[PDB]
């Protein structure tokens, strides 16, 4: 988080995404804000001018002037509220418009061709992508708009008040006040250097105190078996004393530093301000400004004095806004990292995953109802080769059974099957990403109606395009014997958190009902049909055979060996067996 | 977190712990703070009185009066800084003294007779005890002192300024201003009711947006196998629109509410203030106050006007302090819950652990070198009986081997052995908590020197009491062949995080070196000697036999069966076997 030319360039790009045109609504809010910033400055100076006239009326014991200027203030009261609150409304809307624009751009780039998947399970340059896509966008939009507003308001205030004081007091007044404020700020900043060192030391000691307590907790049983209460007490007490003595020293230093700070920045500023403003008055022979009535002297003094105070407050605010620029730089850096990674992924380039050409080798061809592995060395994307050259085919209507110990390498095969990981040479055949399925032990369950659950990848209008009437959907439910669920929550339209409402067996049955509804070419059964009866398994397998859906199974059960022709076996050290059938066993 | 009489009573007790005497240092800081609060109020009113005299000197074009009162301000400048910063220093010290007193009391009650162990592994009324013992104490002390200061400063300011205005303007002025401020506050609070409802709705929608994104992350592989990019995009976009439309409505309402707030509380307050202060002036026949010079009229007006402003600011601050009282109540409730549980544990009473008399049944006798289970039905403290009546003895010099599948019930036996869990009937014999040992797979390793590691439950002065010279300690290291570690980090005094510096085998060897150094009566070997050679195991077992230390083993290895007389076997359903020896196997 350091401000350079790269920082500004990166802001320019991000803002270009956030301001696409010149006649959008963001430009409308920007001009609205600029107009209200100028109006707000004028309203503030008018209040300064009118307040002294009300007070001169009161002091002069004149009811005419008091009432005249009080009514001027009352009649102008609503306009000031509009000018201030319309500014706030414009700023809030600009933040919200910025958020919507950035989120649309990020998510359009994000939900495209496994990029959401690759971001976490194929790269490591960003963790917790959801946090960065949601929280950082809001924070960045808020920070950029807050910086704009907080640098645009003080700037105008300082310009106007310096211009007016150049005439009321002369160029010497504002210059001397600003010179003192700058010098005092530098001097106090130099004096306040140690606070940072003491602050980090305090945080370190508090961290040590927390860590020691946590250790005493996690190892409470072993300590309890010992009679070590009189020892852990000594250790924690010693750590507490270490922290406490530092706190004394930090408090004493803060007291000493505060004393000088109050004297220099709080009261000598008042003395300098009195000296600066008093020049036109105490100079009885001042050229032209002040040879006037008492009321004129009263008004001129208090107008000038209040202008100096508000000018100095503006200097403080602009300093604060400059400090907030650092946070803006931090948010921009994170967002720029995100945008870079999306650009890398969307073009296939990836780096730092969690040797042949890692970023894709060989070729992939497109065909239907045919899968052909031809010298494809499936491997982890890190480059670690899982196995030697592998070759096998599943031509049509053929079932393959995966057997062996805990695989840890078959997942790689399944991921390359659905383009999830790059190819590593040879030539391979696949359909167009829509003909492959994979149901884990607990299939994916969405939030919404049961019709959404069974029509997951498609919308209702998509179903109408296919013409699948709800009766056929019920038949698919009937085949898996899930038709009774329709009455559980009052029809299809019922919306519930289906992730936990259904039991395991129900989830797998609906998942295969979804498989039935889709009628794809290939599917993977990653040992999911574990909470269902044998009869239903054979019943669904019979449908799969009759329909023509090729199926991959990982059951390993003897009956499933009888129901499958091919088989794959791995020893955990690198090997694979592929043949027609086994007479009795491997 | 609701204020009642119980809340105040609980504060009284906690503060009684925090203020033990009447002549301590806390009472010194309290009187110091009270004196500085009064001085700070007087200094503020003096500045109000002197500022108008400086300004009347400037306006009067009188260098004599300007210089006179400016020098009065300069000469009194250091005293005001002392009065303000000595108040801040006193408040900080009172917070720190409060923290030290409370922490000492809590930890004295906490580290006593397994109470640290029971708090987390025998009850459930508090989780994360370290967080409550460390963070809540600091926050509570800060909150109580902040409430005291922020209710004591505005109170004095309001009293002084109302008293002075009762004479400057009359009782009508302060009364009318306070009446308007109260009425406006009530009216605006009534108008601002919906903001809370909209705020919670906004937080709910943001939570939904975060949850949906997280779901898209955790289920990215299954979605990827599908071509569902065009569906999760629709779901997330719909959720974003739901949030965004609410944000529009919330922004528009905030704009509308702000407009009324500015008009009523920001400017009509100024109009009412002008009307209130102007009464003595515009009344040309005012009885006595104002029949005076222009400078007197100038000074009287601005003194009164500034007093009204600071009185009203004090009303705002006291309102804020009252709001902070709610947080104080929350912290007190948590601390009172902690104190109650420590009191329950320290007397043996416990509730809600994670049927016979759960809180202790039977009796425990004290003896050395003898352990006698007599009809003790060991069970979980929840009351669920693990096994039926159990009886066996380990008289002297006898070794017992535990065998079977994953136990899950032997841990209960070991915990009752070291008084960690209550007895459930019968009569049992144990030594005085100092003769039992238990080394897990990874023994406990402290932060400190190696001498601390081997002398864990004892201090260096304790070792000098026993007279164990460092040569004998080295011999204990030599027996376990850990003498070479002395040169690894430059002698005993080297301090390092021994939790991870040592490898497993080294940790167990030092743990048994600690066992050797202590020479207790009974010890438990929870399958820890797994990363050590067979020769060293026999070598250490020979020492244990020769020394006379009875030993319990959980190895299950055949050679260890040969080296152990008794044995315990559990089937996981409730049973135990205890006999002299086994000819070949169970
Ligand atoms: C219009 C044209 C023709 C020309 C002008 C055009 C402009 C645009 C050109 C110039 C623009 C400049 C101004 C920009 C500034 C920003 C820059 C870039 C960045 C920085 O910044 S530089 C970087 C490194 N440098 C630092 O980093 C330390 C500097 N740091 C600070 O500048 C602040 O951080 C502090 C905290 C020090 C100042 O802020 P602050 O302390 O709050 O101001 P303060 O002095 O308290 O108020 C004023 C006081 O006038 C007194 N007073 C007068 N009259 C009366 C009266 N009649 N009655 C009672 N009192 C009176 C009274 O004492 C009142 O104060 P009081 O009544 O409240 O006690
Ligand atoms: C000494 C003895 C003899 C007798 C007195 C003894 C005392 C101790 C007895 C009385 C103590 C009472 C006072 C205690 C109070 C606390 C109570 C218990 C709790 C509450 O509280 S009740 C609970 C339910 N009730 C609410 O919950 C809504 C109530 N909520 C509020 O009370 C605040 O929350 C707000 C925000 C509304 C008020 O605070 P605030 O708005 O900040 O005050 P504000 O009106 O702005 O300042 C004053 C304005 O005088 C104007 N002004 C005058 N003269 C001039 C001039 N020459 N030039 C320019 N302007 C002038 C100017 O307009 C200035 O203001 P400005 O120049 O800045 O615009």
From Swiss-Prot, chains A, B:
It catalyses: a very long-chain fatty acyl-CoA + H2O = a very long-chain fatty acid + CoA + H(+); a very long-chain fatty acid(in) + ATP + H2O = a very long-chain fatty acid(out) + ADP + phosphate + H(+); a long-chain fatty acyl-CoA + H2O = a long-chain fatty acid + CoA + H(+); a long-chain fatty acid(in) + ATP + H2O = a long-chain fatty acid(out) + ADP + phosphate + H(+). Residues 371-586 form the ABC transporter domain. The chain crosses the membrane at residues 28-48, 70-90, 168-188, 257-277. Keywords: Acetylation, ATP-binding, Glycoprotein, Hydrolase, Membrane, Nucleotide-binding, Peroxisome, Phosphoprotein, Translocase, Transmembrane, Transmembrane helix, Transport, Ubl conjugation. Pfam families: ABC_membrane_2, ABC_tran. Its EC number is 3.1.2.-, 7.6.2.-. PANTHER family: ATP-BINDING CASSETTE SUB-FAMILY D MEMBER 3, ATP-BINDING CASSETTE, SUB-FAMILY D MEMBER. Homodimers. Can form heterodimers with ABCD1 and ABCD2. Dimerization is necessary to form an active transporter. Interacts with PEX19; mediates the targeting of ABCD3 to peroxisomes. It is linked to Congenital bile acid synthesis defect 5: An autosomal recessive disorder characterized by hepatosplenomegaly, hepatic fibrosis, progressive liver failure, and accumulation of peroxisomal C27-bile acid intermediates in plasma. Broad substrate specificity ATP-dependent transporter of the ATP-binding cassette (ABC) family that catalyzes the transport of long-chain fatty acids (LCFA)-CoA, dicarboxylic acids-CoA, long-branched-chain fatty acids-CoA and bile acids from the cytosol to the peroxisome lumen for beta-oxydation. Has fatty acyl-CoA thioesterase and ATPase activities. Probably hydrolyzes fatty acyl-CoAs into free fatty acids prior to their ATP-dependent transport into peroxisomes. Belongs to the ABC transporter superfamily. ABCD family. Peroxisomal fatty acyl CoA transporter (TC 3.A.1.203) subfamily. This is ATP-binding cassette sub-family D member 3. It comes from Homo sapiens (Human).
């Amino acid at each position: 988080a350091v401000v350079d030319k790269v920082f500004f360039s990166r802001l320019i790009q991000i803002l270009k995404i956030m301001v696409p045109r010149t006649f959008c609504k963001e430009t409308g809010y920007l001009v609205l804000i600029a107009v209200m910033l100028v109006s707000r400055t004028y309203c503030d100076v008018w209040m300064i001018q009118n307040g002294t006239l009300i007070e001169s009326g009161i002091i002069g014991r004149s009811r005419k002037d008091f009432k005249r200027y009080l009514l001027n203030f009352i009649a102008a009261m609503p306009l000031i509220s509009l000018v201030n609150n319309f500014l706030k409304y414009g700023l809030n809307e600009l933040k919200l418009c910025f958020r919507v624009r950035l989120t649309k751009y990020l998510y359009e780039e994000y939900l495209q061709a496994f990029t959401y998947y690759k971001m976490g399970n194929l790269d490591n340059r960003i963790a917790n992508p959801d946090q960065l896509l949601t929280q950082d966008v809001e924070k960045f939009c808020n920070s950029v708009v807050d910086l704009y507003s907080n640098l645009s308001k003080p700037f105008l205030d300082i310009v106007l008040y310096i211009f007016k004081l150049t005439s009321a007091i002369g160029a010497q007044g504002p210059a001397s006040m600003m010179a003192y404020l700058v010098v005092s700020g530098l001097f106090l900043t130099r004096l306040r250097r140690p606070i940072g060192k003491m602050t980090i030391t305090e945080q370190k000691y508090e961290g040590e105190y927390r860590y020691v307590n946590s250790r005493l907790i996690t190892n409470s049983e072993e300590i309890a078996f010992y009679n070590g209460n009189k020892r852990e007490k000594q250790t924690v007490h010693s750590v507490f004393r270490k922290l406490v003595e530092h706190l004394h020293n930090f408090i004493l230093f803060r007291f000493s530093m505060g004393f000088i700070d109050s004297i220099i920045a709080k009261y000598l500023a008042t003395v300098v301000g009195y000296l600066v403003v008093s020049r036109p008055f105490l100079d009885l022979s001042h050229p032209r400004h002040l040879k006037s009535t008492h009321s004129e002297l009263l008004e001129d003094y208090y107008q000038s004095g209040r202008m100096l105070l508000r000018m100095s407050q503006a200097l403080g605010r602009i300093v604060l806004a400059g400090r907030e620029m650092t946070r803006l730089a931090g948010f921009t850096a994170r967002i720029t990292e995100l945008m870079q990674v999306l650009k890398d992924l969307n073009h296939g380039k990836y780096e730092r995953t969690m040797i042949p050409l890692i970023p894709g080798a060989g070729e992939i061809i497109i065909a239907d109802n045919i899968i052909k592995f031809d010298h494809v060395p499936l491997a982890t994307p890190n480059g670690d080769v899982l196995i030697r050259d592998l070759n096998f085919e599943v031509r049509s209507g053929a079932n393959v059974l995966i057997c062996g110990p805990n695989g840890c390498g078959k997942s790689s095969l399944f991921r390359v099957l659905g383009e999830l990981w790059p190819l590593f040479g040879g030539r391979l055949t696949k359909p167009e990403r829509g003909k492959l399925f994979y149901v884990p032990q607990r299939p994916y369950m969405t939030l919404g109606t049961l019709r959404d659950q069974v029509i997951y990848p498609d919308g209702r209008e998509d179903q109408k395009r296919k013409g699948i009437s709800d009766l056929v959907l019920k038949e698919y439910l009937d085949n898996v014997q899930l038709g009774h669920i329709l009455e559980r929550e009052g029809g299809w339209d019922s919306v519930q958190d289906w992730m936990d409402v259904l039991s395991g067996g129900e989830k797998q049955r609906m998942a295969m009902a979804r498989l039935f509804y889709h009628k794809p070419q290939f599917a993977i059964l990653d040992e999911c049909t574990s909470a269902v009866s044998v009869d239903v398994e054979g019943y669904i397998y019979s449908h799969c055979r009759k329909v023509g859906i090729t199926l991959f199974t990982v059951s390993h059960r003897k009956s499933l060996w009888k129901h499958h022709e091919y088989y794959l076996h791995m020893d955990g050290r690198g090997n694979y067996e592929f043949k027609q059938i086994t007479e009795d066993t491997v």
